[PDB]
Amino acid sequence: SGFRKMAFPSGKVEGCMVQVTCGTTTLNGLWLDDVVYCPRHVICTSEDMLNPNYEDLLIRKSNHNFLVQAGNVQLRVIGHSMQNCVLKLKVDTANPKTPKYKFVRIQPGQTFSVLACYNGSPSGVYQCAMRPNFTIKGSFLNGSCGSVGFNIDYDCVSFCYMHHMELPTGVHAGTDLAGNFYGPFVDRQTAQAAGTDTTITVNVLAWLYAAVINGDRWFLNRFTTTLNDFNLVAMKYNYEPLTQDHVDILGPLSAQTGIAVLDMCASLKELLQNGMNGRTILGSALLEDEFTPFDVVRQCSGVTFQ
Amino acid sequence: SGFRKMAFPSGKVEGCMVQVTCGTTTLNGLWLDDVVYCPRHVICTSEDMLNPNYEDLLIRKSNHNFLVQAGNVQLRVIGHSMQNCVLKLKVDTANPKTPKYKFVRIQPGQTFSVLACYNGSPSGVYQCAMRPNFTIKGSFLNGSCGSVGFNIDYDCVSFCYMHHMELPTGVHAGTDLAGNFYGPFVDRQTAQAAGTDTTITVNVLAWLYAAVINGDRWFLNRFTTTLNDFNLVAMKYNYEPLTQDHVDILGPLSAQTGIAVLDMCASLKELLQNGMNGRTILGSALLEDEFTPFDVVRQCSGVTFQ
Ligand SMILES: *[C@H](O)[C@H](C[C@@H]1CCNC1=O)NC(=O)[C@H](CC1CCCCC1)NC(=O)[C@@H](NC(=O)OCc1cccc(Cl)c1)C(C)C
Ligand SMILES: *[C@H](O)[C@H](C[C@@H]1CCNC1=O)NC(=O)[C@H](CC1CCCCC1)NC(=O)[C@@H](NC(=O)OCc1cccc(Cl)c1)C(C)C
């Protein structure tokens, strides 16, 4: 037993991290087969950032302007292209450590592991959620751009995030691996703000099922509630609406604990209305929303990857 | 910016995990050079667990009783020995993925990353502390024994923990990699209990410095306090004593934030006496104690590993 904020094992991704240098800018890139993916603002200069036109910054570069380090080995760029907000640098060598992989664009509420990197070298791994406002609450310093977020499914790495920038509230914005920003953000140093965030209700319910699986039951109660009456309470406390689809997804957890989804909703209602009153759940004094139903089942039943 | 419960990149350790099977028992082992390390209770049978004498369970085994899987490859055991509570299986093949490594026995309060594994395959990674009562609050199911805890220092993996058993409060006990239990625990299924735990005070102070580095300052105040007067408050709230040595270790953080250690202690005092009163620190509504001063500096300045 026990319940931890668990990240996927990171080795498959560590083998893909490289350093990309252009001008005075160094960041991380992702080397899969013979292509290195990285944020396109690597081609920006210090004066170039209020309203850059990337289609030249790029038409003005030559391949030899791109310095790619794979550890103790320089990789030669033989071509470059831009796809939305990511650069793709064609190099003359295929990454022999290339895992089985997919690029996926995730929905808000979905979680993923982030391998934070500087100068092509991994620094740490942690677990994140895509917030409803399409930011992630990450841990990123200068040089971490191009670090990627990912999930692993048996043997396949599904990359879903690459890091680009930090917003004034200290939260983070980036793209999928095909270069499309999550949320309304753009890669230009102009006024931008996160927008109002909300709590991921289906994930909170999943984490309460995790708690029950692990022996915390103090928050359960008699009651039930309807979906409508639950969603009226959620909306006051700035929680995302719970859909019938969320309910079905919570089915396996409901069935394993014997607590109907709508009963767990009644418990969450009283937690929102009364608070926790000096008690904790799974070592937390807040309602945690960065575990999906799948994360809970994965961690509480022991799914592996190879 | 941002602050996350960060684990070390796990790839160097993933390359060392193997499956060990003996009789009806399957668990994980750690394959470094030509030796596989695993818990010695792998040689116990279902009837053998109330007071086993391992010196035979072992004298009765032959090498061919040990089934070791390195993925799709069976490893042949050519020798075995017991060191305290770990088995060492000499195999005929050296692990080519063997990193630079050390075995270290850590002090309570020190943190480490755990690569949770089942059947030799990694399941997830997370960050733990050795509690003052020498348990760890892990996430472990049947089959996770032999999963290891570790730190990374530039290029070197310092292994510090291997998992053995779960105590009735849902917390976990195990050994260093030379087989010595942390705490008073023994590998026999007889009555054992964790003992009273306490909060790791030096780590709480480090996490408050992390908060200041990251823009949470609401908890700072006028006051100062003496070490003695702080420790009188800590003892009432079941906190570990703060030593002058802890104070010196907190020096770099003190110097980077401009907040004297003893001033941060005055802040922690008021947090203990008044609570947080509906406010959070670094996304937590509790005082967090599983970041060391070194973790804070590592994450807030961007140290990497290669
Ligand atoms: C890349 O490694 C780096 C990572 C961040 C640095 C600190 N934490 C990070 O996650 N990214 C950056 O430094 C970007 C540079 C590019 C260059 C031009 C194209 C877009 C950004 N800069 C930022 O993240 C800055 N934030 C930012 O510009 O956000 C929008 C914005 C713009 C103007 C004015 C405001 Cl108030 C906000 C950071 C302030 C460094
Ligand atoms: C190995 O993969 C497994 C991992 C644990 C299973 C559930 N979570 C885990 O971390 N370890 C075990 O199953 C051990 C087996 C050995 C075999 C004999 C030598 C010592 C233990 N068993 C346990 O962890 C059990 N706990 C336990 O025995 O703790 C002390 C104890 C003993 C007697 C009575 C009490 Cl109340 C407590 C678990 C209960 C499975």
Swiss-Prot record, chains A, B:
Reaction(s) this enzyme catalyzes, per UniProt: TSAVLQ-|-SGFRK-NH2 and SGVTFQ-|-GKFKK the two peptides corresponding to the two self-cleavage sites of the SARS 3C-like proteinase are the two most reactive peptide substrates. The enzyme exhibits a strong preference for substrates containing Gln at P1 position and Leu at P2 position
What does UniProt list under activity regulation? Answer: Inhibited by pyridone-containing alpha-ketoamides compounds 13a and 13b. In turn, alpha-ketoamide 13b (tert-butyl (1-((S)-1-(((S)-4-(benzylamino)-3,4-dioxo-1-((S)-2-oxopyrrolidin-3-yl)butan-2-yl)amino)-3-cyclopropyl-1-oxopropan-2-yl)-2-oxo-1,2-dihydropyridin-3-yl)carbamate) inhibits SARS-CoV-2 replication in human lung cells. Inhibited ex vivo by michael acceptor inhibitor N3. Inhibited ex vivo by compound 11a and 11b.
Taking every annotated instance into account, which residue ranges of this chain make up the domain Peptidase C30? 1-306
User: Which residues are on the Cytoplasmic side of the membrane?
Assistant: 1-306
Active site: residue positions: 41, 145
Position(s), cross-link Glycyl lysine isopeptide (Lys-Gly) (interchain with G-Cter in ubiquitin): 5, 90
Location comes to: Host cytoplasm; Host Golgi apparatus; Host nucleus
Role, per record? Cleaves the C-terminus of replicase polyprotein at 11 sites. Recognizes substrates containing the core sequence [ILMVF]-Q-|-[SGACN]. Cleaves and inactivates human TRMT1, preventing tRNA guanine(26)-dimethylation of tRNAs. May cleave human NLRP1 in lung epithelial cells, thereby activating the NLRP1 inflammasome pathway. May cleave human GSDMD, triggering alternative GSDME-mediated epithelial cell death upon activation of the NLRP1 inflammasome, which may enhance the release interleukins 1B, 6, 16 and 18. Also able to bind an ADP-ribose-1''-phosphate (ADRP).
Under the subunit heading, UniProt states: 3CL-PRO exists as monomer and homodimer. Only the homodimer shows catalytic activity. Interacts with host FBXO22; this interaction promotes the proteasomal degradation of nsp5.
Protein known as: 3C-like proteinase nsp5
Question: To which species is this protein native?
Answer: Severe acute respiratory syndrome coronavirus 2
